[PDB]
Amino acid sequence: KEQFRETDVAKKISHICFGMKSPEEMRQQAHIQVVSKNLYSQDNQHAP
Amino acid sequence: ADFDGDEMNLHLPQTEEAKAEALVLMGTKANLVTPRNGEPLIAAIQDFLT
Amino acid sequence: QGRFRGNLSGKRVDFSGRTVISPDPNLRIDEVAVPVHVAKILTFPEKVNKANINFLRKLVQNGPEVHPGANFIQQRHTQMKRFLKYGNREKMAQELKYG
Amino acid sequence: RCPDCGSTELVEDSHYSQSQLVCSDCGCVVTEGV
Amino acid sequence: MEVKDANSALLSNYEVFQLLTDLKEQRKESGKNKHSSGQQNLNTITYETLKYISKTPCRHQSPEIVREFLTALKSHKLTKAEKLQLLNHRPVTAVEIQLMVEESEERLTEEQIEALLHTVTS
Amino acid sequence: TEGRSRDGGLRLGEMERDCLIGYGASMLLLERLMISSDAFEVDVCGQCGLLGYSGWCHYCKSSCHVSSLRIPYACKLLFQELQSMNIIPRLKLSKYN
Amino acid sequence: FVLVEMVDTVRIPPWQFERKLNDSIAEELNKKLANKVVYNVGLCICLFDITKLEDAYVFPGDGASHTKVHFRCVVFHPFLDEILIGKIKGCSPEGVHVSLGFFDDILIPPESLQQPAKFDEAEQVWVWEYGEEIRFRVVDESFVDTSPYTLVGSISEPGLGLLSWW
Amino acid sequence: DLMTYKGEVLGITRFGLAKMKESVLMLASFEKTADHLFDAAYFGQKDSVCGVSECIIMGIPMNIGTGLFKLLHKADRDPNPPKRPLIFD
Amino acid sequence: LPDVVLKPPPLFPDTDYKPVPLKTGEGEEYMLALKQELRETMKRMPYFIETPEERQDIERYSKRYMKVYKEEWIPDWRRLPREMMP
Amino acid sequence: RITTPYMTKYERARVLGTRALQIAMCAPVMVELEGETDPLLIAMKELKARKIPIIIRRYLPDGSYEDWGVDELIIT
RNA sequence: UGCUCGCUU
Numbered sequence: 095k096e097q098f099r100e101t102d103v104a105k106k107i108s109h110i111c112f113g114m115k116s117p118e119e120m121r122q123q124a125h126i127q128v129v130s131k132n133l134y135s136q137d138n139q140h141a142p
Numbered sequence: 143a144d145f146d147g148d149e150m151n152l153h154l155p156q157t158e159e160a161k162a163e164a165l166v167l168m169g170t171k172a173n174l175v176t177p178r179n180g181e182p183l184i185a186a187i188q189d190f191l192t
Numbered sequence: 193q194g195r196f197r198g199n200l201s202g203k204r205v206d207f208s209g210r211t212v213i214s215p216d217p218n219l220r221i222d223e224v225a226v227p228v229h230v231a232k233i234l235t236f237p238e239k240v241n242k243a244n245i246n247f248l249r250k251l252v253q254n255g256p257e258v259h260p261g262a263n264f265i266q267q268r269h270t271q272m273k274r275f276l277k278y279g280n281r282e283k284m285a286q287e288l289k290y291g
Numbered sequence: 292r293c294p295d296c297g298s299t300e301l302v303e304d305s306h307y308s309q310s311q312l313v314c315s316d317c318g319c320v321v322t323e324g325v
Numbered sequence: 326m327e328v329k330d331a332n333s334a335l336l337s338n339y340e341v342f343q344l345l346t347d348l349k350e351q352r353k354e355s356g357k358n359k360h361s362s363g364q365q366n367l368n369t370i371t372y373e374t375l376k377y378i379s380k381t382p383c384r385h386q387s388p389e390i391v392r393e394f395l396t397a398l399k400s401h402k403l404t405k406a407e408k409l410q411l412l413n414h415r416p417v418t419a420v421e422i423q424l425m426v427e428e429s430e431e432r433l434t435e436e437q438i439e440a441l442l443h444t445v446t447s
Numbered sequence: 448t449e450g451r452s453r454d455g456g457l458r459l460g461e462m463e464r465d466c467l468i469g470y471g472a473s474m475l476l477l478e479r480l481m482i483s484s485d486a487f488e489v490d491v492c493g494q495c496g497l498l499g500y501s502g503w504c505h506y507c508k509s510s511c512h513v514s515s516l517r518i519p520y521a522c523k524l525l526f527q528e529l530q531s532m533n534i535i536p537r538l539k540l541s542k543y544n
Numbered sequence: 545f546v547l548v549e550m551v552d553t554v555r556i557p558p559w560q561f562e563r564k565l566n567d568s569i570a571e572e573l574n575k576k577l578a579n580k581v582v583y584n585v586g587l588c589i590c591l592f593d594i595t596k597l598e599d600a601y602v603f604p605g606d607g608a609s610h611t612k613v614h615f616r617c618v619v620f621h622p623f624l625d626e627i628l629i630g631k632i633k634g635c636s637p638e639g640v641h642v643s644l645g646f647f648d649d650i651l652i653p654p655e656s657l658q659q660p661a662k663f664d665e666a667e668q669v670w671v672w673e674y675g676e677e678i679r680f681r682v683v684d685e686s687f688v689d690t691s692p693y694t695l696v697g698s699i700s701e702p703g704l705g706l707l708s709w710w
Numbered sequence: 711d712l713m714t715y716k717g718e719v720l721g722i723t724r725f726g727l728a729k730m731k732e733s734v735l736m737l738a739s740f741e742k743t744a745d746h747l748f749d750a751a752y753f754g755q756k757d758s759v760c761g762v763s764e765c766i767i768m769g770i771p772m773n774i775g776t777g778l779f780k781l782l783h784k785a786d787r788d789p790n791p792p793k794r795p796l797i798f799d
Numbered sequence: 800l801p802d803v804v805l806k807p808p809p810l811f812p813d814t815d816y817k818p819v820p821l822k823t824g825e826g827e828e829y830m831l832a833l834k835q836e837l838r839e840t841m842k843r844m845p846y847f848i849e850t851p852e853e854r855q856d857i858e859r860y861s862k863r864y865m866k867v868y869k870e871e872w873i874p875d876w877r878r879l880p881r882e883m884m885p
Numbered sequence: 886r887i888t889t890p891y892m893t894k895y896e897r898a899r900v901l902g903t904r905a906l907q908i909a910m911c912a913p914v915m916v917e918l919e920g921e922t923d924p925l926l927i928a929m930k931e932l933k934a935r936k937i938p939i940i941i942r943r944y945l946p947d948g949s950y951e952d953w954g955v956d957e958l959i960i961t
Numbered sequence: 962u963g964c965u966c967g968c969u970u
């Protein structure tokens with residue numbers, strides 16, 4: 095009927111592990127690809 | 143301070159635990175002496191010693 | 193003005209004021225005078241319990257105009273705040289639940 | 292409209308340097324902070 | 326919220342019935358309005374499971390009877406699942422052990438069925 | 448904000464932080480620098496250690512290991528800037544117990 | 545029905561201190577695991593008992609009492625061969641809709657093994673003659689949250705004879 | 711003692727501070743922010759939350775002061791409550 | 800000037816050069832068949848250790864019938880150090 | 886049993902703050918307050934009466950722990 | 962937003 099899933103847990107950060115990302119991991123993390131050099135549109139609304 | 147136009151800051155805690163800790167640890171009656179050498183700083187001043 | 197020194201180690205906070213000082217020997221060493229104008233602005237969140245229920249009722253009935261009072265009420269069930277300058281403060285006081 | 296009473300008397304009244312759109316009937320704070 | 330073992334120990338329906346009855350009596354003795362209003366699914370599940378176990382013949386059972394039945398079946402080298410099913414169902418007919426009960430081949434022997442019926446009916 | 452004309456608040460400088468540390472009022476320092484200044488709730492994925500949104504991790508395309516966490520908005524901005532600089536901080540969360 | 549060991553960090557607010565800690569923990573665990581299906585475990589019914597209960601901490605945050613409690617709870621999870629007795633709460637063309645008594649309407653017996661007179665013409669016709677028995681075959685669980693049910697199981701009804709009802 | 715606890719007199723400057731301390735966050739907040747951050751990213755050094763500076767940065771109660779110990783509630787309870795006996799097993 | 804692009808490049812850009820077809824012959828066919836036979840016969844070899852199954856549900860009389868049986872090779876403990884004896 | 890039997894100011898402050906928060910969250914009072922609308926004042930009264938149901942769990946650097954009751958410790 | 966300037970601490 096209903097599945098058991100925890101709502102919130104009192105999670106505490108233990109330690110920060112610094113590192114680096116490969117280009118594949120960067121692509122996976124990113125959502126879209128930015129290729130246009132302009133900022134706003136040509137119309138008078140100046141929409142991005 | 144010397145009361146010659148000095149501006150001082152006043153903060154109000156927003157938590158009961160912070161309020162209690164400020165009143166206990168940072169109490170004026172509990173911090174009458176400095177930790178440098180134990181000499182009392184909160185004492186008489188001009189117009190009181192005379 | 194960096195993120196480590198300007199936004200992490202030392203950062204600006206609310207519920208604070210800055211004012212000039214003046215001497216007053218008639219107060220204790222552990223006491224400080226606060227003006228009514230800054231007192232009406234700096235508010236403290238008190239939780240409605242079985243002890244100060246009547247005091248909070250009286251404060252709400254007084255409202256934001258009179259010095260002893262409050263400015264906003266956040267219900268226990270819903271987190272939608274309510275401004276005391278508008279609405280029936282008497283009804284808001286009569287409908288003060290614990291928490 | 293107001294989420295509590297459903298009224299449309301939503302006025303933008305800044306209370307001591309705090310921009311706040313609040314209902315003018317029951318005082319329910321609709322939005323606060325900018 | 327992790328679990329350590331989902332199959333720690335199997336239990337028959339009598340233990341579940343006793344637990345449900347105890348929870349129900351404790352609930353009706355210490356009913357709390359706000360606790361009940363916070364989650365009403367507990368009451369529904371408890372009541373419906375109790376009603377199902379009541380519809381079942383699980384009544385008229387006791388730990389002494391369960392222990393006697395277990396000791397009687399221990400001499401039949403039957404498996405825990407078989408004896409659990411037999412205790413939960415209380416079969417009064419022979420066909421229920423002949424066909425419905427699994428692992429029938431080489432286990433019935435056409436002579437142990439009478440003893441099984443006598444033990445489950447006693 | 449900074450200025451009074453801009454409706455700005457006071458600044459608890461590094462010296463104020465040092466005074467609070469010397470006093471040892473840990474809860475007071477926390478309420479001042481985290482709760483009342485830049486309190487925010489973020490979503491961190493327990494698998495990759497990255498920051499999620501609305502209880503969802505776009506990196507792993509899953510939401511089972513995503514958990515909420517209190518964090519200063521300045522600290523979140525620092526983490527984002529480091530991730531942009533390619534210095535990825537991987538946060539390994541655990542129970543408070 | 546089977547026992548399952550669990551370890552939960554229960555948070556009790558301060559206004560429940562007058563109550564007994566064990567009773568409050570039991571009530572909270574029941575309210576949290578009432579009518580919910582734990583993945584790869586099954587549908588939990590209620591709390592059976594509490595085995596270990598260590599010290600109760602109080603965090604500098606919410607201020608409530610957090611207790612790590614080890615307990616055993618009863619869950620409905622057959623062993624792939626258990627026999628059950630349910631009631632027909634409907635029927636579909638592709639398969640009957642049997643439901644255990646007021647317990648769960650999730651049993652979906654596939655009609656692909658009975659004698660060769662099996663068909664459902666949507667008129668709630670169970671089967672052409674020559675308390676309904678069920679034999680659990682396999683379990684299956686699934687997740688729910690996948691964007692910014694969970695227990696059906698397979699049922700079998702072999703040529704059991706059923707001298708009482710065809 | 712803090713200056714001469716590693717067997718060598720280390721000054722309070724950035725060099726001695728880096729030689730004594732280990733918190734990447736503290737070393738970055740003090741001086742040479744980008745250099746220390748890139749060095750830590752290269753070394754893959756994991757930084758704990760034991761220090762006061764990183765505690766304040768992450769917004770958690772520091773270990774020093776009132777946060778060194780923990781408090782327990784004196785609730786009416788009974789450790790290891792009686793267990794219900796299993797009849798079938 | 801370089802023109803502005805509205806949509807991103809295709810995830811898999813087309814190429815006018817195609818891979819050269821594979822070499823044909825009885826030798827290549829026999830090598831393929833032998834590699835397939837090795838794939839099929841090396842999984843059942845005792846050296847191919849499988850993940851030990853655990854968490855058995857129950858014990859049954861059909862356990863002896865469904866018991867997986869397979870001969871196990873005996874390593875040479877004279878050549879292998881003593882740290883690998885069971 | 887090896888630590889100092891006196892209750893430090895940090896412990897005093899933390900216990901008072903926790904008790905004030907609990908009382909503000911509708912916790913039962915064990916001193917029968919007489920018109921005290923301040924949770925911190927109620928907590929100070931409970932501390933002076935030695936009726937705060939809180940046990941300090943002092944942790945040693947190595948990992949060991951020891952429990953000390955408020956009524957067991959010495960106040961100033 | 963950035964910066965500069967002039968100022969009380």
Ligand SMILES: *O[C@@H]1[C@H](O)[C@@H](COP(=O)(O)OP(=O)(O)OP(=O)(O)O)O[C@H]1n1cnc2c(=O)[nH]c(N)nc21
Pocket residue numbers: 962
């Ligand atoms: O940085 C400032 C300031 O922090 C921020 C404050 O917002 P407002 O500009 O006051 O917006 P408001 O809501 O008041 O106006 P509107 O009704 O929405 O149109 O804005 C930034 N800011 C203010 N003035 C600025 C300026 O002239 N130039 C730059 N760069 N930033 C400005």
Ligand SMILES: Nc1ncnc2c1ncn2[C@@H]1O[C@H](COP(=O)(O)OP(=O)(O)OP(=O)(O)O)C[C@H]1O
Pocket residue numbers: 970
């Ligand atoms: N740059 C600054 N940094 C820190 N504090 C300052 C600074 N400028 C002024 N102050 C504040 O003002 C005070 C300085 O006053 P002080 O120098 O003692 O007297 P004065 O200004 O010499 O007066 P007289 O000339 O002696 O009459 C102390 C300090 O808190």
Ligand SMILES: [Mg+2]
Pocket residue numbers: 143144145146147148
């Ligand atoms: Mg001056």
Ligand SMILES: [Zn+2]
Pocket residue numbers: 492493494495496497504506507508
């Ligand atoms: Zn992830």
